[PDB]
Design a protein around this ligand. Structure first.
Ligand SMILES: [Cl-]
Ligand SMILES: [Cu+2]
Ligand SMILES: [Cu+2]
Ligand SMILES: [Cu+2]
Ligand SMILES: [Cu+2]
Ligand SMILES: [Cu+2]
Lengths: 471, 465
């Protein structure tokens, strides 16, 4: 009786509705769109076909389309250089391609079209998170080896702003360069090359020779990452947007800070400090027309992912490794982020070791729950935490598979869709969870080392639960 | 609804697929939906990893480990699928990789093309004992059979065409002489000199229906009128014999694997003789004389009991030709016994270029391929009475078919012409209905279910392609 009678998969896909899942492949070098209504992959693209010899396809965000099945657009970026050598693949390659591309891709109802390489046009090769603006007409990219982020206009493919963030440690000893505090300097960059182009293509600008991998923020202090400016790294990760407009939050993994910027005048306004027991925030002081500083007397723990709730009234930052928890600020005062204060922290006895790390997140459309991945190194099963986002309590934890990464949600709020990625070498897949029962409904096969996933949105209200407000 | 009931109908089988233009290989667990492992060829410095064909060897427990061969194409094969790449100098490719799954990940064990000097980019087939494998190439018109344990060449042959009429449009229709030459290594350490694009007569593998494009002057290359377009070396499951398919002359040349000689040439076309003789003209050279070539042919393969051989005529006829090969002792006695035709099968399309039998031999499933935008599908053929039963539409660009070794489900892949919809399709062999499609990032031109026993190879990438 253990073998099911002949069973068709139609009922399974029919429940999800008409939603398209987009995924980058990391070491596979691909991007792909899947139709959750039929199980068909609608299209894919392999970067090496176009002459990118190191297409580590990393992060992406998609823009609202009135009918994704007829067409949509998205940005996907890459890493490059010695990032090829950090996931245990026994490649004999001597000189890896430079990478750090930023590609604009359009689905036309049949296939993907590679529209442009925005890194080649602008000179900004940035390899970490890609976030759409709340209006769907721009996007940001950050990089945690160069510590640069920029916001871009989609229609003109031009740079709206670019900033460099630097650390100056109180103690020059690598082991204590963050623990014992330091000064973070924020500089608004100006282009230096003809046509308003920046000089940051490829590996140019890297302070360290490869990324701090998932779970690996302390590998730099710990003396395992080479580079020419090791003790100046902050590891910028993402720029996430307040859905009510005006503010963005730039996450710096090593100092454990989220720097709030005013997008109206492009200035940093306050620094939120992640660690439990530390102040809600630290002031930002302007020291020159283009330069601001934040002073920290210690750094308690690094931090990971950040996000605003769909209504913009809560901001989350995940402390990791030295503390593993979800830190929550009351951001209800839209007029003045200097007033944003810590209101809750989600903790659990099972989070007391180095791992699991509280990781990527997605909120339900109504804000009532947030789903948060729980990351561990091999071989512990990674999983999903379900959190009550009104009372800030852990409801449930479920095991999924190795190397759990990002989460998306269908825009009717019914199904969370996530990816796990096998550390680029073992089991990978797409996991779907029902948000009413909080149960896994199934795993679909996936050739991918994905560190992202998005469901293509139809409207700007969808972006409030997409790769815009959170990572 | 949960997917558990869906995966629970399958049993414990691993599907292995190459990605073609994705550059990947992957294994998926049909009992849970998980991808077990994958490998990306570009990560290893293969700059044009068009991952093409593959065969897996019997494993006592595939979930604890298994081994396979996957090859690549290279050169201007990058440029024939409509991708608007600006690459000017494509990687040489034509690698042959041995890959092992260890229960957790894939391990690239060796590049047998580098070790042997034979870079061969079309079908890979396992031998019936699971201890060797063949690779053929239809740009170079070379094939070889290899020993797995020693990673060494057992035999290699070159096949060449001398046309009766040197005009390109008439170079096959008006006949010619096919010369078969046993090759010997020419470099130190018993290595051949055929790596990368070395030896190509044409700049890409002929497409489905592509014999007409070669005749019309649309395929570039240095020896366009001397190509036969070898496709595969498929094995008689009873041992002793292999069949080398040559697409352009529409011939399957039968080899004796013990003394490495060609013994007879089966001629695909309806209305033509069952076979032509092979004449030995020198110690290492044999000839086949053809006064005309009535039509090309492509898919070729044996039924699981070895008693039937199939060759699919395409282009100028469109049918499945069937020989009685019940006489294992003497292939010169193999004789045409049936032809599967249909009013909907004419010309180049559908192009019937992959198949799989049920373990009991009662049915054969055959791909029905067409160019965009015609829906592609699967034909179900009665392999006892030799008649078409049913055709099912699947999606764009239907490619290979495998079967679970209990006979219950055909598992196939479709591939989007490297640019549109792709997926894994699963069909119930009792109802002959699709039970579902699973997503697949792949342009796969092959697929296999990892076998446990040598008997399983009778219905894997051994007896058919
Ligand atoms: Cl054998
Ligand atoms: Cu049972
Ligand atoms: Cu991140
Ligand atoms: Cu990542
Ligand atoms: Cu073939
Ligand atoms: Cu192919």
């Amino acid at each position: 009786g253990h073998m099911a009678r002949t069973t068709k998969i139609e009922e399974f896909y029919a429940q999800f509705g008409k939603y398209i899942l987009l995924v980058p492949g990391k070491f596979t070098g691909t991007v792909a769109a899947h139709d959750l209504s039929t199980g068909r992959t609608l299209a894919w693209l392999a970067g090496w076909n176009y002459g990118d010899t190191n297409p580590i396809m990393h992060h992406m965000a998609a823009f609202p389309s009135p009918d994704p099945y007829k067409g949509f657009e998205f940005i996907v970026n890459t890493q490059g250089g010695k990032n090829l050598f950090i996931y245990g693949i026994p490649t004999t390659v001597k000189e890896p391609g430079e990478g750090f591309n930023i590609y604009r891709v359009r689905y036309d109802g049949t296939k993907f079209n590679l529209v442009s390489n925005i890194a080649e046009k602008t000179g900004l090769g940035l390899g970490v998170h890609v976030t759409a603006t709340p209006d769907g007409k721009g996007f940001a990219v950050a990089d945690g080896q160069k510590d640069i982020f920029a916001e871009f206009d989609l229609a003109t493919e031009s740079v709206r702003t670019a900033f460099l963030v630097d650390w100056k440690p109180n103690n020059s000893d690598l082991k204590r360069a963050w623990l014992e505090g330091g000064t973070m300097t924020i500089t608004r960059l100006k282009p230096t090359l003809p046509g308003g182009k920046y000089d940051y293509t490829g590996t140019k600008g890297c302070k360290i020779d490869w990324e701090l991998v998932p779970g690996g923020e302390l590998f730099l202090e710990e003396g395992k990452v080479t580079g020419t400016r090791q003790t100046n790294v902050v590891a910028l990760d993402a720029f996430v947007y307040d859905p009510r407009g005006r503010w963005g939050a730039l996450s710096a993994r090593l100092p454990g800070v989220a720097i709030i910027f005013d997008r109206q005048d492009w200035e940093p306004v306050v620094a939120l400090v992640g660690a439990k027991g530390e102040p809600s925030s630290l002031p930002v002081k302007k020291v020159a027309s283009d330069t601001w500083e934040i002073k920290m007397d210690k750094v308690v723990t690094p931090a990971h992912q950040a996000g605003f709730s769909p209504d913009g009234k809560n901001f989350l930052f995940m402390n990791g490794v030295r503390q593993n928890n979800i830190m929550v600020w009351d951001t209800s005062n839209h007029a003045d982020p200097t007033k944003w204060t810590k209101k809750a922290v989600v903790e659990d006895p099972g989070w007391r070791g180095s791992y699991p790390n509280t990781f990527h997140m997605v909120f339900t459309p109504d804000g009532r729950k947030v789903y948060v991945t729980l990351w561990w190194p091999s071989p512990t099963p990674n999983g999903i935490a379900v959190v009550d986002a009104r009372n800030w309590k852990l409801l449930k934890s479920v095991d999924i598979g190795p190397d759990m990464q990002t989460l998306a949600i269908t825009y009717d709020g019914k199904y969370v869709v996530g990816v796990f990625s096998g550390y680029q070498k073992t089991a990978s897949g797409i996991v779907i969870m029902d948000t009413k029962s909080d149960e896994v409904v199934g795993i679909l096969p996936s050739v991918g080392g994905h560190h992202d996933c998005v469901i293509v949105p139809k409207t700007v209200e969808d972006l409030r639960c997409s790769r815009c407000t959170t990572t």
